[PDB]
Amino acid sequence: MIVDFYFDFLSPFSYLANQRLSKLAQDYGLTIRYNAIDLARVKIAIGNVGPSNRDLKVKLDYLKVDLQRWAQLYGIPLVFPANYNSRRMNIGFYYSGAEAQAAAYVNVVFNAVWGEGIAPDLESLPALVSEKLGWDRSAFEHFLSSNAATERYDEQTHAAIERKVFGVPTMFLGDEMWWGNDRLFMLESAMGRLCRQNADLSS
Amino acid sequence: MIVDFYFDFLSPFSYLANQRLSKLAQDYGLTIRYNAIDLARVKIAIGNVGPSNRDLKVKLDYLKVDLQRWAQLYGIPLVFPANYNSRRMNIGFYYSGAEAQAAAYVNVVFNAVWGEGIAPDLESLPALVSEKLGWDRSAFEHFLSSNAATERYDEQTHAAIERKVFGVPTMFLGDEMWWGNDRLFMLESAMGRLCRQNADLSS
Ligand SMILES: N[C@@H](CCC(=O)N[C@@H](CS)C(=O)NCC(=O)O)C(=O)O
Ligand SMILES: N[C@@H](CCC(=O)N[C@@H](CS)C(=O)NCC(=O)O)C(=O)O
Ligand SMILES: O=C(O)C(=O)/C=C\c1ccccc1O
Ligand SMILES: O=C(O)C(=O)/C=C\c1ccccc1O
């Protein structure tokens, strides 16, 4: 069974969605196709150009409580990094090869940025992540600055916009799209239905 | 047990939150304090001045699916009215006296506007609602245009802004605030905890 998952490492809701999806992948063997995209570009594309939630103090005060609530529900830490400069790490996703390595990348970077609150533009973060994944630090850093890497990122963000993605985390299963970690229960129900039909418990 | 509920009849998420809260009120006798407020004013107050979700076609296309999903979950119709001009009906809430009459007003107006898709500024809607509630149509319509009615509305919206309400539906229980029909599960859990402690099942 395949879910397409769209995220931007600047998003704490994406951090939560990624933890929950990864546990479905590990516990139930669900297949996730990962897509790192530019939330900024996708917003601009649909004309969503007002102030961001991050720039609206009263709303941000609440969302920080909401985020701690879900973190507690999921039994994980959630710590705000010093900035939302996620471009380099988003691009770095496209170095990953196989499913297992793409998932490991996404989990290591999310845990570093939103689990530990490490700035996503920290200059040593590519090396720290390379060590964890057993990658060649220098090859990885060279990839991060390559024209091809930015092209791959641009391509995927474009494909997301074509698919009517307007925010993150967004998940597709078949023709159904859900936006939000708080919609994963709907994805989980859709998944159960498809499991039952494929088991002939349901027509 | 008392929940403060903040809503604007223009909000379909508020329509959903109201259906779920009303069923808690009827099934479990939870006490709801209702507050009709001006979502527009509360947004402006916190600097949330970009385009609204209603003006962003790609996002609105998705939210209409989200809204049908929840409507199906709750076993209720949800039909978009022709406009979001909720001021008159919001003001009309402050005609209501007791809890039972305030709840009946809110349920009748929500069901008319978002259950049936009746324009909230329809000129005959005050009379239709008056008939349903056994009110004096003319007294009700006179109240709707009164300076006092607008003052009461302005007062409550102000009190909401002071309480750091930035959107609707918003629910408070004690010092905890949740925004969204999709957060009522958290309110329900908080409510269960308080029931258990008061039953001495939990410290
Ligand atoms: N209710 C959410 C909201 C997710 C959300 O606010 N995502 C942000 C990025 S973290 C977003 O896509 N903003 C774009 C928008 O609001 O249209 C959930 O619980 O995940
Ligand atoms: N995730 C929500 C969202 C509720 C929502 O989008 N509310 C609108 C009015 S219907 C709002 O308060 N907008 C203000 C904002 O986004 O800050 C829920 O499921 O109820
Ligand atoms: O770029 C954005 O639009 C944005 O607000 C992302 C950051 C965010 C969203 C929601 C809650 C907290 C937070 O930092
Ligand atoms: O006034 C607003 O800000 C607004 O978008 C309210 C309307 C709304 C919100 C979310 C989904 C559909 C919808 O009509």
Side-chain angles (χ1 to χ4, degrees):
Chain A
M1 169 156 27
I2 298 179
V3 169
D4 297 331
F5 173 38
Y6 294 81
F7 65 87
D8 182 328
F9 292 114
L10 70 66
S11 173
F13 289 104
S14 294
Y15 163 65
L16 292 172
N18 181 63
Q19 197 271 170
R20 178 153 180 168
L21 284 162
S22 73
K23 286 195 149 50
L24 297 168
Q26 77 175 48
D27 283 2
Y28 313 128
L30 182 241
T31 302
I32 303 162
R33 301 195 297 215
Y34 294 92
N35 305 272
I37 61 168
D38 189 343
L39 173 54
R41 275 204 304 274
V42 311
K43 289 178 72 189
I44 275 295
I46 67 146
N48 184 182
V49 299
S52 303
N53 289 346
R54 70 200 219 210
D55 299 307
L56 266 7
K57 179 177 171 300
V58 169
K59 193 165 172 195
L60 179 65
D61 285 349
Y62 167 76
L63 290 168
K64 287 174 166 180
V65 173
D66 190 37
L67 284 167
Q68 300 297 321
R69 285 172 183 148
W70 285 92
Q72 179 187 281
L73 292 170
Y74 289 183
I76 61 174
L78 192 152
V79 178
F80 271 66
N83 64 62
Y84 296 97
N85 297 332
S86 53
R87 171 179 277 265
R88 218 134 61 195
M89 301 308 292
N90 278 355
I91 293 168
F93 165 74
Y94 295 97
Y95 193 85
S96 62
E99 221 189 307
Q101 279 291 80
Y105 179 80
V106 168
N107 290 341
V108 174
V109 175
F110 262 127
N111 174 73
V113 171
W114 285 101
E116 293 187 65
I118 292 169
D121 59 0
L122 171 62
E123 291 260 18
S124 52
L125 188 53
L128 284 164
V129 164
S130 285
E131 175 68 19
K132 180 59 155 184
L133 295 174
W135 288 348
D136 184 289
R137 164 196 67 69
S138 181
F140 184 49
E141 301 174 333
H142 279 66
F143 174 77
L144 290 180
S145 54
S146 67
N147 292 317
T150 287
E151 291 174 12
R152 279 145 85 146
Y153 183 43
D154 291 349
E155 285 172 10
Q156 291 317 112
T157 298
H158 188 261
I161 293 172
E162 289 185 71
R163 218 174 164 188
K164 311 228 317 174
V165 174
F166 59 81
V168 294
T170 297
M171 285 72 54
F172 289 78
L173 177 69
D175 292 300
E176 289 190 286
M177 188 180 90
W178 296 270
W179 168 56
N181 165 76
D182 60 3
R183 290 301 183 278
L184 288 169
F185 79 97
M186 296 181 176
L187 173 53
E188 288 166 7
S189 289
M191 290 200 289
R193 277 199 285 291
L194 283 193
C195 298
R196 285 189 297 284
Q197 295 168 347
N198 287 332
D200 299 326
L201 302 170
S202 287
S203 41
Chain B
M1 169 156 27
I2 298 179
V3 169
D4 297 331
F5 173 38
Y6 294 81
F7 65 87
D8 182 328
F9 292 114
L10 70 66
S11 173
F13 289 104
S14 294
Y15 163 65
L16 292 172
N18 181 63
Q19 197 271 170
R20 178 153 180 168
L21 284 162
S22 73
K23 286 195 149 50
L24 297 168
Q26 77 175 48
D27 283 2
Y28 313 128
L30 182 241
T31 302
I32 303 162
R33 301 195 297 215
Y34 294 92
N35 305 272
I37 61 168
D38 189 343
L39 173 54
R41 275 204 304 274
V42 311
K43 289 178 72 189
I44 275 295
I46 67 146
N48 184 182
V49 299
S52 303
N53 289 346
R54 70 200 219 210
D55 299 307
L56 266 7
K57 179 177 171 300
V58 169
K59 193 165 172 195
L60 179 65
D61 285 349
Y62 167 76
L63 290 168
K64 287 174 166 180
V65 173
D66 190 37
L67 284 167
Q68 300 297 321
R69 285 172 183 148
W70 285 92
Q72 179 187 281
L73 292 170
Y74 289 183
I76 61 174
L78 192 152
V79 178
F80 271 66
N83 64 62
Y84 296 97
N85 297 332
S86 53
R87 171 179 277 265
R88 218 134 61 195
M89 301 308 292
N90 278 355
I91 293 168
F93 165 74
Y94 295 97
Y95 193 85
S96 62
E99 221 189 307
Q101 279 291 80
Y105 179 80
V106 168
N107 290 341
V108 174
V109 175
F110 262 127
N111 174 73
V113 171
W114 285 101
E116 293 187 65
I118 292 169
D121 59 0
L122 171 62
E123 291 260 18
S124 52
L125 188 53
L128 284 164
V129 164
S130 285
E131 175 68 19
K132 180 59 155 184
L133 295 174
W135 288 348
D136 184 289
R137 164 196 67 69
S138 181
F140 184 49
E141 301 174 333
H142 279 66
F143 174 77
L144 290 180
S145 54
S146 67
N147 292 317
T150 287
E151 291 174 12
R152 279 145 85 146
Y153 183 43
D154 291 349
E155 285 172 10
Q156 291 317 112
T157 298
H158 188 261
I161 293 172
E162 289 185 71
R163 218 174 164 188
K164 311 228 317 174
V165 174
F166 59 81
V168 294
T170 297
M171 285 72 54
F172 289 78
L173 177 69
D175 292 300
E176 289 190 286
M177 188 180 90
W178 296 270
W179 168 56
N181 165 76
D182 60 3
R183 290 301 183 278
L184 288 169
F185 79 97
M186 296 181 176
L187 173 53
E188 288 166 7
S189 289
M191 290 200 289
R193 277 199 285 291
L194 283 193
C195 298
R196 285 189 297 284
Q197 295 168 347
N198 287 332
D200 299 326
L201 302 170
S202 287
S203 41

